[PDB]
Symmetry: D2
Subunit: 388 residues, 4 copies
């Protein structure tokens, strides 16, 4: 019947999302700034579970130690009054002109040292607020031209930075983990660790890999034309999906950050299906931008649509899996065999198995249809609620 | 003056490249098949170092043990007469209809067992011929629809397969290593391990990671809009660039496999620059298709252009790096600082360093230009041979 | 409740669609060839309205005049027995090696003359069978390299060819019109008249523009990352949508030709909405390929899914428009004002209108939200059948 | 030897190019604003021919009639002192929040009337300054969601607007023409008239088509993965290339606006080749953004690189065409035949010509290679200055 979200659904929003003033490359802001406290109250009314923030969203850049203290106190009371949580925090290493060539991988060494200190300062605040995950989006790490950045040295600097933060966390005894958010491009011509895969590979080279995971975003992988649910499957397979950014994107172009459900709808369905069947227990975080055509009423409707869409898809995906006709179709397509080991009998046995080569009837096997189209139409019917 | 390749340049070609008959999705072959022996002699005349092959290129599918023996003997004499080497070999797990849903990750278990036996048989042949690398391109591993393939189970099957081959190699005492070739899509809607990053991450989950590397292809990463030289830098950083496939691609669309140099020319320049300065010593393998508009004279001209283009770029990249004006520009852009550790002084020292935050003048740092445009124009001048 | 198609729905299929044997760039056929007569009977059973064909699908290439006559007679009886119609026909100017550099724009003049004769021969057959539209897809018209094709001369040849066919039709007194099908690339590196826009512009340069329209395909425009429904709106605006090819595509990559409904689902919804509200009365033609993983049962299920998906979307789009809440939302977003002339009062009046500039309150106007997000969520609810 | 530009080369720059302060979606300005007068003097020193402007670049928005007059006088003296010309002008209908849903196609009628008045006011100024072309880039014309914009009505409003401007120009007796600049997306999710083709088609529906042309931009067509030189060939073929925007773009992603020469280098070569051989006599306008990593010295170096790159390519393209070996290769590939009419003998003659079908030897024709690869390698050698 209806689709009301409750804090139990674990839906979270960055302050910078509903707070996006509408400034784009070709235009000025179309909305006034939101007081983070108003955003907390409004999201709470909508059924959200918590909020996330960059240091600079909560405490204006260059704020003194006193002003800083007041901003946090104000934010803290709003949280106490609403029951909202703060499961994730991050650093802004992309807005200020000093980070024009990056933070952790800036060619200027002094800039790199500054970026680390700025991050460390915010990690202490994040722990103070109860955040369990600390996200790192290296938006300025990259280049527009080939000779500007030696990638191998840049990767040495990136590893050095992450190892230092890991040494810091472990020395303060914090119970906080890191999640690297990949993005292929924008604002840099090409960004380092462009996809979930590159991020996962890099993590295996850190001194304490256990502390690092990935924070994939729907639109980012889609900006590279990749299959998001497949990338998420691989991150789960590796045990590295620490957090997730949900939104929508219409193909390969600029990062749109539409509300979740918009963009590639079928991909959204397969994503929810995967997260739910895999038992993902982390937050369902929306990193979206309510389009600039909207006024404040439009932003809250956009935020509500994020949660609504997730809930509808969850219903349809659940109905899909529980359908006996679908369970039969899955067996018809041999999904059950895919889950069985190819050779639990071992190498030697396989080599001696004449049924696996010498006596294998390749034409008989080749003639078997996979029945994938029937299966996919069942999935389509379920998504559209068209199952008679 | 001129650009003649010699076997010392380590240029290699797959038999399937100059041998591509021109069959495409919408058209029939425009060229007769080439006898692998003729291809060996022709490539040798052109200055190539060696050739590579899929089992099915050398020995027709379904060949008896006797015919098989004759085909190899014939091929062996051609190699002896020309001095050509065979540094890499691979398996064809994509053409025959039996592999329509994959080889190692086919839902059908019997198909998966067959794919392993077929690969093992060819590994023995590869070692016999002296190949040091065995490439694996899972072209049929993937899907067109969401419910057809459970990616986590598929990744379990992929790992199982690679671990078994690793157990085989180590048991026969072979001195051969594996290289996984990624591709984002085509012929499947989405292919598993779509980019160099995903492949590198997966490798870290194998039982014997030391035996596996990556075989990236210029056009494949470009089909995802990614920066190829950056991906190669990361593979080198990880010590996993075991082999490389060179060709050209005009952006995001079907896999064109144009001759090397064609497609994104500037990317080709930065690639050669990187491979040469990094001391890549493996083969410079061309996996290209001479367009179907060509007759045989056109195919040999296309193959020659591959090597010619590599040699010209190598000259221009060498001239770029050795230019004192460029060395000065590199210092102006702080590439030297990027190579210096951010905090060799350690964590505690960084936290106590007031020059890294408290007394850091952010406006002064922000005002410094990176001088990247001057550097890039110097690179452009060098590429075009326009340095006065 | 259910979604059964009937010939009244005007659903048509090319013989080459359900008949696609599964041959792709990296693989052999996975299905035997279908007798066109069997395809006619099977599609009729499924509720289809008619079929379409290339000359070479019906009459094997190189067939004598007698064999040709028999093939047509056989096909004719199948049509008579089923009541199926043939509303569109086309020429195959892409498969045979002679068309490797094109048909109408081949550099070889003799080839260009041959292509015209081949098309003319099939136009006579099309009229004989009752086809009202003749489609032209210049799949081989284009290039892989810059100097191979002088585009201005190629466009002169393209216009010459179309003008000649127009002169032929008008001289035989045929009641048949032409529809040019655009495609950005594949099989050529870049194809001439790459999008609906380029095709529409070209048509305005023909001697008898009235005889030519466009035959857009969902996936083709999406291979250029364009909004298909927007392109269709422009073709309707110009009065040039003579026919349409329906299928699915997952973004920018090779031409997938998935069944309709698959690919970008939301785009499919907006397309059906537009065609139905605009009163498009031509055929709903599916130019799709049942994936090669399927056997014959899978191909017929895929074809049925094409029609089913169109019918479901038509229902949801109709429900969307007829919803009073949606009609109210449309007024809230000023869609009614968009339909009103900006200045029916004329130029002079506008220049003298102080309310249009001098006394225009720009801040007041800027503050009005467009309410687009609320509208889009209503559309999402309707698509998913989630309207309470 | 060297490549110095002189005003005779007709190189022009928009004030907004070298003046771009570096503000992007994720960052603040990294450069102070430039006084348009300083930009005029600086560009003049670099060898530029003239500058272009949006109304809002020259006269701050909301300026009184007096301030307006002073700004123009100041700008006028700078032009007189340098000898710089102003060949093109345009309107800013994208920055101010009032244009959030468009200017000419905004759903709000009052906004549409305001946009026309604002444009008309600037047309008078453009003529006053001597501009021969008036560009219109409908950056805000489009949508993020399907129901927000009825495209057919939007196209009615777009035509109404352009017809009114045409009526205005013709009534004032101005000798100024319009050029529509297409762009597929950004800042809107999808922009109306997304490519050169769509723009050309639309123009044929205006009341006075003679007054309208197109202003294509390198990067814009490349954001749709299209071949820019091919699009330019079609615009020239139609006699509609009134102006051109030159820059660089690295594939399908956000609009980078790199300096000319950067991005797809080979495409830049083929573009210059075409413009020069076609005798394009309009300005060579650069619409680029010096990357934000740069300080002012870097912006002037970037602007100089634009002109330098154009001059180098012009040299290489000229050398390519004048090479007798290339002229021979062109004949070998039948470019001379492409330029010959297919059937100047007429329709009836073609139908009676047995050599065009009945007696046409298709196998003989099919066997002829096009020799395109040899031709393309000659072009590569010339571009790289590697012709021995
Ligand atoms: O496009 C950029 C990212 O998606 C951005 O929102 C990061 O997620 C954020 O800075 C970390 O919380
Ligand atoms: O597009 C596919 C690949 O590039 C293919 O050529 C593989 O490289 C080959 O099968 C391994 O040698
Ligand atoms: O991708 C190519 C086209 O879509 C093709 O199927 C044409 O439509 C056909 O040849 C005309 O009927
Ligand atoms: O990306 C947008 C355009 O390229 C822009 O610069 C227009 O050209 C300009 O507003 C007209 O002069
Ligand atoms: Ni993002
Ligand atoms: Ni994003
Ligand atoms: Ni994010
Ligand atoms: Ni490849
Ligand atoms: Ni390839
Ligand atoms: Ni390859
Ligand atoms: Ni098609
Ligand atoms: Ni298609
Ligand atoms: Ni089609
Ligand atoms: Ni632009
Ligand atoms: Ni641009
Ligand atoms: Ni422009």
């Amino acid at each position: 019947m209806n689709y009301q979200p409750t804090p139990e659904d674990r839906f979270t929003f960055g302050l910078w999302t509903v707070g996006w003033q509408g400034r784009d490359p070709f235009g000025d802001a179309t909305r006034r700034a939101l007081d983070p406290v108003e955003s907390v109250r409004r999201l709470a009314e909508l059924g959200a579970h918590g909020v996330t923030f960059h240091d600079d969203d909560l405490i204006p850049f260059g704020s003194s130690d006193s002003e800083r203290e007041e901003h946090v106190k104000r934010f803290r009371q709003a949280l106490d009054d609403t029951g909202m949580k703060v499961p994730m925090a991050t650093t802004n290493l992309f807005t200020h002109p000093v980070f024009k060539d990056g933070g952790f991988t800036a060619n200027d060494r002094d800039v790199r040292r500054y970026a680390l200190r700025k991050t460390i300062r915010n990690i202490d605040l994040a722990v103070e607020l109860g955040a369990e995950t600390y996200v790192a989006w290296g938006g300025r790490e990259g280049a527009e031209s080939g000779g500007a950045k030696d990638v191998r040295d840049a990767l040495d600097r990136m590893k050095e930075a992450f190892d230092l933060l890991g040494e810091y966390v472990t020395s303060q005894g914090y119970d906080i983990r890191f999640a690297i958010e990949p993005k292929p491009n924008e604002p840099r011509g090409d960004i380092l660790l462009p996809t979930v895969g590159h991020a996962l590979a890099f993590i295996e080279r850190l001194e304490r890999p256990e502390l690092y995971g990935v924070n994939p975003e729907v639109g980012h992988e889609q900006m590279a034309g990749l299959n998001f649910p497949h990338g998420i499957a691989q991150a789960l397979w590796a045990g590295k999906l620490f957090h997730i950014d949900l939104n929508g994107q219409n193909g390969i172009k600029y990062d749109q950050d539409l509300r979740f459900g918009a963009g590639d709808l079928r991909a959204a369905f397969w994503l929810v299906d995967l997260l739910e069947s895999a038992g993902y227990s982390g937050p369902r975080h929306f990193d979206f931008k309510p389009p600039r055509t909207e006024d404040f009423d439009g932003v809250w409707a956009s935020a509500a649509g994020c949660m609504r869409n997730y809930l509808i898809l969850k219903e349809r995906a659940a109905a899909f899996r529980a359908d006996p006709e679908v369970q039969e179709a899955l067996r018809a397509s041999r999904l059950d065999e895919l889950a069985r080991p190819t050779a639990a009998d071992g190498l030697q046995a396989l080599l001696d198995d004449r049924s696996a080569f010498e006596e294998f009837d390749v034409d008989a096997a080749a003639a078997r249809g996979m029945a994938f189209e029937r299966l996919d139409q069942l999935a389509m019917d379920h998504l559209l609620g068209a199952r008679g």
